[PDB]
Design a protein around this ligand. Structure first.
Ligand SMILES: *[C@@H]1O[C@H](CO)[C@@H](O)[C@H](O)[C@H]1NC(C)=O
Length: 189
């Protein structure tokens, strides 16, 4: 009685917090259509993770996704005799760029070794760059300046000429994702 079970998408990527749906189509005469999550459990509809069968189709909607929603889902149709067919879909879930507690301005006294703080996160880990504003926002090349392993900007023996606007830029190259925060750096003489 079951000709074919398929899901509209085979693979989908989404960020934590994003919502997505999938449609299972069971051509023929299914008696039941159920979904199983990556933990292997039969999905019982809730407010956040919803299943609805309508004719020979079943829709799974995942609202406000979290990392534990990631993995392979199965749609299993069953006919009246108890024979089953199934299809699968893969959900890949990542974390988009997120800046935390941005502080601006940040003040330093001339001569001290400054650390300009920037806190950005993502999965995979973000690639961070610091840039300096003039007419064009440009990448910094100066021997007193270095990005630290915690993504902050070290400025050795900070001078009044170092005062200005600094851009903390976060990138995830594999997605082409980019975001930034401009930080006013003040040097008290
Ligand atoms: C720091 O400020 C001084 C004072 O004007 C100036 O000579 C210069 O722009 C800065 N020194 C450098 C370039 O490191």
């Amino acid at each position: 009685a079951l000709l074919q079970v398929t899901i509209s998408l085979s693979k989908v990527e989404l960020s934590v917090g994003e919502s997505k749906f999938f449609t299972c189509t069971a051509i023929g005469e299914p008696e039941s259509i159920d979904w199983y999550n990556p933990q292997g459990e039969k999905i019982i509809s809730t407010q956040r993770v919803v299943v609805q069968k309508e004719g020979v189709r079943s829709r799974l909607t995942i609202y406000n996704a979290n990392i534990e929603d990631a993995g392979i889902y199965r749609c299993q149709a069953t006919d009246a005799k108890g024979q089953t067919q199934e299809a699968t879909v893969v959900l890949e879930i990542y974390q988009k760029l997120t800046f935390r507690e941005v502080v601006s301005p940040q003040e330093f006294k001339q001569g001290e070794d400054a650390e300009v703080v920037c806190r950005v996160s993502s999965s995979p880990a973000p690639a961070v760059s610091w840039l300096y504003h003039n007419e064009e926002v440009t990448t910094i090349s100066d021997n007193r300046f270095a990005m630290l392993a915690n993504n902050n900007l070290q400025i050795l023996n900070i001078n009044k000429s170092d005062e200005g606007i600094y851009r903390c830029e976060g990138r995830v190259e594999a997605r082409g994702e980019i975001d930034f925060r401009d930080i006013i750096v003040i040097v008290n003489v």
